[PDB]
Amino acid sequence: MSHAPATPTEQELRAELTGPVTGAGRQIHARGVWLAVDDPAFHLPRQGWKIHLSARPATLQETIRRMLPAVLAVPCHFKVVRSGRHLQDLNSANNHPGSIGKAVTIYPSPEDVAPLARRLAEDLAGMAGPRICSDRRVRPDAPVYYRYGPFHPCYDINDDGDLELVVTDPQGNTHPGAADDSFWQPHWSPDPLTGATPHPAPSVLLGGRYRVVGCVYRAIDTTDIIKEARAHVNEDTLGRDSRLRLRNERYVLHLLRDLDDVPKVIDHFRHEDREYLAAENGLYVADPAPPGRSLRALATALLELLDHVHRRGVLVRDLTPTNVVLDDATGRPRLVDFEISHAEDPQLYGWTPGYSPPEQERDEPATVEADYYSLGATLFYAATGLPPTWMTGDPGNHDPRRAAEVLAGRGGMSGTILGLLDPDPARRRAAADDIRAGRFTDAPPPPPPSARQRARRLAAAIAHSLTELSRHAADLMSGKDFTGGLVGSPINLYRGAAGMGMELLRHDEPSRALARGLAYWTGGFRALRNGRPGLYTGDTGIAVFIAEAGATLGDETLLKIAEPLARPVLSRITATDQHTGLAGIGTGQLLLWRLTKDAGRLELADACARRLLARDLTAELQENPPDYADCGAVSRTLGFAHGLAGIVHFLRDHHAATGETATEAALHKGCDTLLEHLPPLLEAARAVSAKPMHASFCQGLAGIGAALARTGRDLGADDHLQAAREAAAACLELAPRMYALTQCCGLAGIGELFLDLCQITGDRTYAQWADRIADLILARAGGSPEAPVFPDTSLHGSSGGWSIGTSGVVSFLRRLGDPAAPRLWLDPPA
């Protein structure tokens, strides 16, 4: 009928290896998912040329059997994927695209690289496997590839503060390796086979088959969309390839005559190791995608059943806001994906929308009925402008928590989509949206908040968040996440220990002890290691965290560890930015100067300010981009990070500390320029086409307004405070469609602006606005009440970083319950 290829066990591979390996004196150690074999009398260098062997689970055992002679002849180290399942994951694109096909890795002596490769090309013959993109291939008939890279895990720091695997040139410079999933030729070592050292150069496309616009492309026939599949990638337990997925598609594309207006024409061809088959809705320039801006917007909803009635035994099983397109009005319905539109015994495994499918796309049988949870979920993203909330591991990944949007409005669908997103009963797709509203249509019935019990909720949140932080911190310091080609900074403010620690210092004695441990761990990690001087990415924020921990905890040794930490050579620094440049360094040095009272820190801030004042005319840029089109350089010009708002912020702090008149002149000039360019981006924010970027703290109105509020207070100007008020209003309107909950790009920065205005002005109105932001945050959270988990930038996982994770959220929530509590990193300490 339909069969299942061999999936080797770890035991069978161990068996295929044990005999010959013991023969040559080499030995097997299991580590990660790579049964490795070490050979004495072969010292592994640290970089060089390496051989990769591609394979499928089915072929893995034979790949091992036919390689051992060659690899055991020459002294070398090597490793083989743990078992067949680990290889199916490795050859799956969702996990790690650049690691597909690297079933075996062999590290030999340099002189022996070229022979082995060829010697392994022979004996491997026509055995097939996914083509390894990051590497070159010995011959197209064999699954042997090679590349230059690290053999040991040596990391260096990038200009973002993060850590990347590197090789080192003969001058010692670190070059980032194994990135961009493209072959990179070292200029100091020759291609051991071509004998040549190519050079990189820069020198939508003429596909030759059909000249037209990484396995997808857009097209128009060279005569009058070409989906691509790479061989042996995404192989099912039934040996079902991505090319076979295209074949299922071609089937339904020829079974398309009824409702054929919706999908496209077809054409099938193949080349080498790949095959090809022939209005971009989900982009919400229009916020509720208004059918006609009328009171009723069930038009799109009934249009869904328009294609539901197609029947034909075709179960899309994957109806996402990216799987919808509609030229003009509700007419001209279009759709362009059916890879998993099959209920026959060959039922392809989906769960493709991390969030939008039912709880029963666990390969459980398919049902148009089940396509309801994709319908309703689609409807959710239709109203909210944002996906429903799903998190890897959420015991309540499907629940009335979605009701916590309770916006409706455009069509007021409400309880209909609740049934349409209910559990298995399906409510019969809530009566098939009640036969296109013929039977019924529901009205929004939001519940009433429990008044002071809100506080209970809030309390619980912080409480649980604290415990969650304690987990993340342990995962950080134990090196759990210290794997891969890119490792997020384990110490910087943005995502590292310093960001978390600072917040945990302001909480209970256990959380303070966690911050103490984090301080000492950061100190250790930073010693005898490369770094960057920035505030949000680099040494300045780190030093601030350690010194403040030494202060509030009364730990002299912490202050001693921080004393020499952030004293850079400003002459080398060229950026003028809070995030990485001189402005952020100046502010952090002023914070350290207030805690330590070390004159050198004030001198550093003064030096920052002088170098900044030198480029005051260079702060005046004639080119302006009020539209987000191409580079939304609102962030690169006016945002708190990368922009003038943070520069102004630091100049204000410097004047407040010293009183130097030069800083005052430049401050007034920058403030005036910001106010000149404010009205346009305000209008852009108020438009319907606005994007959450316009309200973001890092890049948008929230940061600009925080800066201008502090300026209005300290300078006495009230035009600044009013600018901040208008900014805050725009942010309040854009808050319910924010993508993230974080400080940098999400709701936390909005609410922090509101709290700033309440503390400066005194208008408890902004406190109500902030309470609304916190309510949105608690609703958009996952997990359960008394145990809420907050999604980070991934939208499905949790993390502890301050600006992109849970600790910043905890900062906002904490500050909600303690007025007159300074804003971290923007206001001075108590």
Within 8 A by CB and 6+ apart from 16, the residues are: 61, 64, 65
Question: 741 φ, ψ to 5°?
Answer: -100, 0
Alpha carbon distances (Å) from 198 to 62, 148, 149, 184, 187: 34, 13, 16, 9, 8
Contact 235, 241 (CB under 8 A): yes
Residues in a beta bridge with 270 = 275
Torsion angle, CA of 267/271/273/275, rounded to 10 degrees?
Answer: -10
Cα(658)–Cα(652) distance, integer angstroms: 10
Q: Cα(606)–Cα(589) distance, rounded to whole angstroms?
A: 9
Q: What is the DSSP string of 221-235?
A: -S----EEEETTSS-
| Cα separation values, 22 from 13, 34, 68, 119, 248, Å | 14, 18, 12, 22, 47
- Which residues, in sequence order, are bridge partners of residue 77? 107
Residue type, 288: P
Strand 136-137 to 104-108 pairing: unpaired
| Helix locations, 282-343, DSSP H | 298-308
Please report where in the chains the tokens 């988990």 appear, as a residue.
789
Decide if 500 contacts 802 (C-beta within 8 A).
yes
Cβ atoms of 585 and 570 closer than 8 Å: yes
CA distance 73 to 200: 35
Q: Given the DSSP bridges, would you call strands 104-108 and 34-38 parallel, antiparallel or unpaired? A: unpaired
> At 146, phi and psi to the nearest 5?
-155, 155
Residue found under tokens 């690289």: 113
What whole-number distance in Å separates Cα of residue 159 and Cα of residue 180? 17
Tokens 């702090």 belong to: 653
Cα–Cα distance between 811 and 507 in angstroms, integer?
10
Order of all β-strands in the sheet with 268-271: 227-230, 274-277, 268-271
Residue with tokens 């966690």: 514
CA–CA distance from 134 to each of 15, 148, 153, 203 (Å)?
31, 10, 18, 19
Beta strands in 215-360 (DSSP E): 227-230, 268-271, 274-277, 325-326, 333-334
Q: Is 337 annotated as a binding residue?
A: yes
Which amino acid is located at 277 in the chain? Answer: L
Rounded Cα distance, 243 and 274, in Å: 8
Residues whose CB falls within 8 Å of the CB of residue 751, separated by 6 or more in sequence, listed in order: 769, 770, 773, 774, 777, 812, 816
In this structure, the chain runs to a length of 830
SS3 326: strand
Terminal alpha carbon distance of the chain: 75
In angstroms, rounded to a whole number, what is the distance separating the alpha carbons of residues 375 and 745?
Answer: 29
Q: Which residues pair with 746 in a beta bridge?
A: 740
Structure tokens at 230: 């790479």
Give CA–CA dist 782/393, Å, rounded. 10
Question: CA–CA separation, 29 vs 17, rounded Å?
Answer: 12
DSSP symbol at 435: H
Asked if 136 and 144 count as a contact pair (C-beta separation under 8 A), the reply is no
> What is the spatial distance between Cα 86 and Cα 68, in angstroms, rounded to a whole number?
21
User: DSSP letter string over 519-540?
Assistant: HHHHHHHHTTS-----SSSSHH
Euclidean distance between CA atoms 647 and 531, whole angstroms: 23
Tokens (6 digits) for 344: 């026959």
Specify the DSSP class assigned to residue 827.
S
The two three-digit tokens of residue 565, written as one number: 């930490």
The tokens for 504 are: 């945990």
Report the alpha-carbon distance of residue 68 to residue 445 in Å, rounded.
Answer: 68
| C-alpha torsion 20→24→30→36, nearest 10 | -100
3-state secondary structure of 746: strand
Judge whether 237 and 251 are in contact, CB under 8 Å: no
Strands 174-176 and 268-271: unpaired
Q: Per residue, what are the HEC states of 659-721?
A: CCHHHHHHHHHHHHHHHHHHHHHHHHHHCCCCCHHHHCCCCCHHHHHHHHHHHHHHHCCCHHH
Q: How far apart, in Å, are the Cα atoms of 830 and each of 605, 820, 827?
A: 20, 10, 9
In angstroms, the CA 456 to CA 434 distance is: 39
Q: Which segments of 100-190 are extended strands (E)? A: 104-108, 136-137, 144-150, 155-157, 163-168, 174-176
Token code pair at residue 272: 């080498």
Question: Any idea which residue has 């505030």 for tokens?
Answer: 535
Interatomic CA distance for residues 545 and 553, integer angstroms:
12
Can you give the resolution of this entry in Å? Answer: 2.7
Q: Say how far apart CA 83 and CA 66 lie, in whole Å.
A: 17
Distance CA 152, CA 146 (A): 17
Burial 137-161 (b: 16+ CB within 10 A, else e): bbeeebbbbbbbbbbeeebbbbebb
Contacts of 269 (CB under 8 A, 6+ apart): 209, 275, 276
CA 509, 511, 514, 515 torsion-angle sign: negative
Q: Give the 3-state secondary structure of residue 804.
A: coil
Question: Which 3 state secondary structure label does DSSP give 478?
Answer: coil
Closest CA to 823 of 765, 773, 750: 750
744 marked as part of a ligand binding site? yes
Cα–Cα distance for residue pair 825/548, rounded to 1 Å: 12
Which residues neighbour 331 within 8 Å (Cβ) at sequence distance 6 or greater? none
- Three-class SS state of 286: coil
Q: List, in order, residues 6 or more apart from 683 with CB less than 8 Å away.
A: 626
Cα–Cα distance for residue pair 352/320, rounded to 1 Å: 9
Give, in degrees to the nearest 5, the angle at Cα 109 between 108 and 112. Answer: 85
355 vs 791: CA distance, rounded Å: 13
| 782-784 and 787-789 strand pairing | antiparallel
Phi, psi of 175 (to 5 degrees): -115, 125
DSSP state of 783: E
Q: State the Cα–Cα distance between residues 182 and 644, nearest whole angstrom.
A: 37
CA distances (Å), 159 to each of 167, 437, 452, 530, in order? 17, 55, 46, 11
Tokens of residue 150, six digits = 């690290």
**Residue 745 assigned ligand-binding role:** no
Place of tokens 């919400």: 284
CA pair distance 332, 231, nearest whole angstrom: 35
CB 600 within 8 A of CB 645: no
DSSP element (H, E) containing 81: strand 76-81
Q: How far is the C-alpha of 733 from the C-alpha of 695, rounded, in Å? A: 9
Q: Which residues in the chain have their C atom more than 2.5 Å from the N of the next written residue, marking a break after them? A: 203, 213, 224, 278
Q: Count, in order, helices (H) and strands (E) of the chain.
A: 25, 18
Tokens representing 35?
């049964």
Q: CA-CA-CA-CA torsion for 757, 758, 763, 765, nearest 10 degrees?
A: 90
The 47-53 sheet, strands edge to edge: 27-31, 34-38, 76-81, 104-108, 47-53, 144-150, 136-137
| CA dist list (Å): 136 to 42, 186, 348 | 25, 14, 32
Q: 808 and 499 in contact (C-beta within 8 Å)?
A: yes
Helix, strand and coil in the chain, % to nearest 5: 40, 10, 50
Alpha carbon distance 471, 744 (integer Å): 22
Q: Which two tokens stand for residue 96?
A: 């790690």
Q: What is the DSSP letter of 389?
A: P
Q: Where are the beta strands (DSSP E) in 415-503?
A: 486-487
SS3 state at 744: coil
Asked if 67 contacts 17 with a C-beta cutoff of 8 angstroms, the reply is no
Amino acid at 127: M
d(CA 781, CA 792): 10
> How many other CB atoms are there within 10 angstroms of residue 258's CB atom?
12
In 3D, which of 73, 168, 180 has the Cα closest to residue 119? 73
Give exposure, 539-572, as e/b (b: 16+ Cβ within 10 Å): bbbbbbbbbbbbbbeebeebbebbbebbbbebee
Return the SS3 of 489: coil
Within a 10 A sphere around the Cβ of 509, how many other Cβ atoms? 8
